[PDB]
Design a protein around this ligand. Structure first.
Ligand SMILES: Cn1[nH]c(=O)cc1Nc1ccccc1
Ligand SMILES: Cn1[nH]c(=O)cc1Nc1ccccc1
Ligand SMILES: Cn1[nH]c(=O)cc1Nc1ccccc1
Ligand SMILES: Cn1[nH]c(=O)cc1Nc1ccccc1
Ligand SMILES: [Zn+2]
Ligand SMILES: [Zn+2]
Ligand SMILES: [Zn+2]
Ligand SMILES: [Zn+2]
Lengths: 360, 360
């Protein structure tokens, strides 16, 4: 059975389990069950399933080199699919809530969930809470007797937390740290002194890399009972590196990819985000350019946004990106090589992860 | 050491642990650490700590009748305080998010968190996410080697889920079930056919009773290694009963307690909530009264809200409340008696829980 079909069948299984349990144990009625079914499909389906499928990929890698009964192979694959879905549902939680937080309009060419006419923010916040609770219901049901249950919950827990910490880092990235105060409305930074590579890296490391690359990799090891075949510090390092790279790409696209292609109208400039473009622009700009940046950034006014886009174009940031790219290639290759010492197989899964990110 | 002082010291300990771990492991800076410290205090402190203190109370009950080394008594009490804080932080999560969801103004005589000038909804949603992640960080750290860790996480998990399901039941309670559809903006019910005792009970059972009464009781049993001294079905029944009663009281107060006393301006009528007053009014009203209710309920207009308040006054709902109260007294006493069969001590903790609710 091909990986994607297995993964998608498990979605149907898991959905049916969750909705059946709401009827038998939580006194739900059919109309609310239908609402939740539609919520799950709309928020969890329709992406590329990169994260969930990485869990499946890692597990398949181990199966190819490990002796097992056929029933055991199927069990490990079912586990990897459920675990993949846990990550996809955790992402869905964060997308729902983030879209609300940011007042976002679209996501993947469709309205944000909260904007659906029969949803509203009042329900959507709670819907996003339910998305994440479903991750736990899945784990407790499908993995109840599994030897990796503890380590899987503890890891999941840490990644979730890191993610929420990263969201805080993100939404506060255009404030001056020394001015943060719940009592005082937060001015946008005037100096941009905190738009540095190191500050940027911290945002991205927590907000994206733990759930997008670390969790899928390590969950595939856990459901494979293979975490002792890897040096965990190398897994962390490679995950944080590829994940950073993934975000820089996302930041570039926000500014330069046509809205129809992107699935949304990017607003990083208007939102004054600490993006890779802004940090790298401020890293090479002259005094006059920095001044023109400060006068136009973080403003909804389209004339000012176009001034910022023009400043990025004239600044030839494509060249800084090529250079960053080349350095990421060196380091990712270095880590992959290091991972071969203890597990060729896992090194190869990381290679696959890298190819799917590198050239996308 | 008195229970409240122990409980409050543990708060300081747990806060310090969480903020220290954010500095040493999550790369946090001092200003964001301060923001989170202020968030925790503002959202978790200042209530009566009924829920957290119930865990401590149950545990103290067992200590009085069980042989242990002094160090063990202290360990069990420390555990009960951490576990109490887990519940208080879970409530804080839900209050933060619910206040946002409902567009609430005040809570306990202070502005809702999201309304603080340097917070905003964009941060507050995430803050509420962090509140709940902190429950898990506490459990994994303080209870890592504990024999009850599994059962405690699994229970916690189920209660959290039940709560989010109850929130869905609540926010959808003024819609016609058969009209729920994410594609279509939801009209308020015109018939009120779903304002029944049984539908009401389901809302309250999930939205409040699991986290307010069941979880504190059962967490006190778990940290005491005493869950085999009780019949769990009796614990559930008594928890659901007292919790229902607690909510009916809350519903009455929303309408009739002066705003300064309540800590907020109650808006159940304007929000068209399925309250105990509305269900009991519709249960005794004549045709003309029902018609006047339908014309005025669920409308911000103060003239219409005063018409609804007047209809409740003329309907002498105090008498239905006395009658309900008397029946709750019978049943709670019956369950307490039943609980004495296997544990006098735990029966007595439930009595204390009841006295603190009954006459408050
Ligand atoms: C363009 N420049 N050259 C490198 O080698 C790295 C960067 N910028 C960067 C800063 C923070 C995170 C990721 C990339
Ligand atoms: C201005 N130009 N037009 C596009 O479509 C993309 C870019 N520049 C770019 C910046 C950083 C990395 C890669 C490309
Ligand atoms: C007033 N009436 N008499 C009872 O004995 C109970 C109710 N009403 C009620 C309905 C749903 C939940 C809780 C109370
Ligand atoms: C109208 N009246 N004035 C108050 O202050 C309270 C009530 N009535 C009431 C309704 C149900 C239960 C208890 C009291
Ligand atoms: Zn965001
Ligand atoms: Zn982006
Ligand atoms: Zn609410
Ligand atoms: Zn209320």
């Amino acid at each position: 059975m091909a990986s994607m079909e297995r993964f998608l069948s498990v979605y149907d299984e898991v959905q049916a389990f969750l909705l059946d349990q709401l009827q038998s144990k939580y006194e739900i009625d059919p109309n609310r069950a239908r609402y939740l079914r539609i919520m799950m499909d709309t928020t969890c389906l329709g992406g590329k399933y990169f994260r969930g499928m990485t869990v499946v990929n890692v597990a398949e890698g181990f199966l190819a080199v490990t002796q097992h009964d056929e029933a055991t192979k199927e069990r490990i694959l079912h586990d990897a699919c459920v675990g993949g879905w846990m990550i996809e549902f955790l992402q869905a939680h964060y997308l729902v809530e983030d879209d609300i937080m940011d007042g976002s309009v679209m996501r993947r060419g469709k309205p944000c969930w909260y904007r659906f006419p029969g949803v509203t923010t009042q329900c959507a916040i709670n819907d996003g809470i339910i998305l994440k609770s479903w991750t736990q219901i899945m784990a407790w049901h499908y993995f109840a007797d599994r030897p990796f249950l503890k380590d899987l919950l503890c890891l999941f827990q840490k990644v979730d937390y890191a993610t929420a910490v990263g969201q805080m880092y993100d939404v506060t990235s255009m404030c001056d740290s020394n001015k943060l105060d719940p009592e005082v409305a937060q001015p946008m930074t005037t100096d941009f002194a905190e738009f540095t590579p190191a500050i940027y890296k911290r945002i991205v490391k927590y907000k994206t890399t733990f759930y997008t690359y670390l969790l899928p990799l390590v969950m595939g090891l856990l459901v494979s009972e293979a975490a002792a075949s890897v040096e965990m510090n190398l897994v962390e390092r490679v995950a944080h590196l590829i994940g950073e790279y993934f975000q820089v790409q996302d930041d570039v696209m926000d500014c330069f990819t046509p809205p129809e292609q992107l699935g949304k109208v990017g607003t990083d400039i208007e939102d004054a985000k600490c993006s890779w473009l802004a940090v790298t622009f401020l890293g090479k700009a002259n005094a006059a350019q920095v001044a023109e940046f400060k006068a136009n950034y973080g403003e909804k006014d389209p004339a000012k946004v176009a001034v910022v886009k023009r400043l990025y174009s004239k600044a030839n940031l494509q060249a800084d990106f090529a250079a960053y790219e080349a350095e990421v290639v060196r380091e990712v290759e270095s880590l992959i090589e290091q991972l071969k010492v203890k597990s060729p197989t896992f090194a190869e899964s990381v290679a696959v992860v890298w190819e799917k990110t590198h050239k996308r």
